[PDB]
Every structure is written in C-alpha cells, then in structure tokens.
Chains A and B, each alone.
Chain A
Amino acid sequence: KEQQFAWAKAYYRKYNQETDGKDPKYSKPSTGAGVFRKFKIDWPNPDPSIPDTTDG
C-alpha cells in the first residue's frame, strides 16, 4: 500500500494543479478599498468625496 500511494502521489504531483490559475484581478476589491477610481465606474461627474488616489 505504501508503494501504491507513493505512485499515486507521484501521479498527483505530475498531473494535478493546486488552483485553476484564475486571474488575481477578479479577487481584488473595487469599492471600499480606496481603489475605486481605477475602474472608472463613475467617471462622468465623479463624486468628490471619493479620494482620487488609487493607492488604496
């Protein structure tokens, strides 16, 4: 059984991936993180209270 699961682990490491590789951008917040201006959601007549800086 030890050899069987050793082979299974080798096959797993060869053919399996930890994550699907989705773009990290979809995980980053848009609203409330201080980076709202990046998305240009409210460009026409932007709201002054929202900071212009995109540093977060």
Chain B
Amino acid sequence: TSKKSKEEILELRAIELKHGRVAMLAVLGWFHVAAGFHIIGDLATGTYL
C-alpha cells in the first residue's frame, strides 16, 4: 500500500473485509458440519453425509 492511491486502499480494505466475513461464516459452517449437524444434506441425500 505504500504507492497505492486512496481508492486502491479502500478497495483493498473492501476485499479484506469481504474475505474476512466470508471466512468467519465459512469457519462457522465448517465446524457446524464437522460436528455432524448437516441436516439439509442428510434430508436431500436420504443418508448421513
């Protein structure tokens, strides 16, 4: 960011925040499904995923 302009810095922060939020939700869902608790898939496939 040393040579970037303000718009580029704001876009970098937007990318960072989108990735961070997606990653937080991803970890939540990953642990949720790794604990079992995967009902949508269970019901859709008729079997325990």
- Chain A residues in the interface with B (C-beta under 8 A): 43-45
Of B2-10, B19-27, B35-43, the stretch lying at the interface with chain A is B35-43
Residues in chain B near residue A44, CB distance under 8 A: 39, 42-43, 48
- Can you list 7 A-B contacts with CB-CB less than 8 angstroms, sorted by A residue number? A43-B42, A44-B39, A44-B42, A44-B43, A44-B48, A45-B36, A45-B37
Measuring CB to CB, which residues of chain B are less than 8 angstroms from any residue of chain A?
Answer: 36-37, 39, 42-43, 48
Residues of B within 8 A of A43 (CB): 42
Chain A neighbourhood of B37, CB < 8 A: 45
Across the A-B interface, the 6 shortest Cβ-Cβ residue pairs? A44-B42, A44-B39, A45-B36, A44-B48, A44-B43, A45-B37
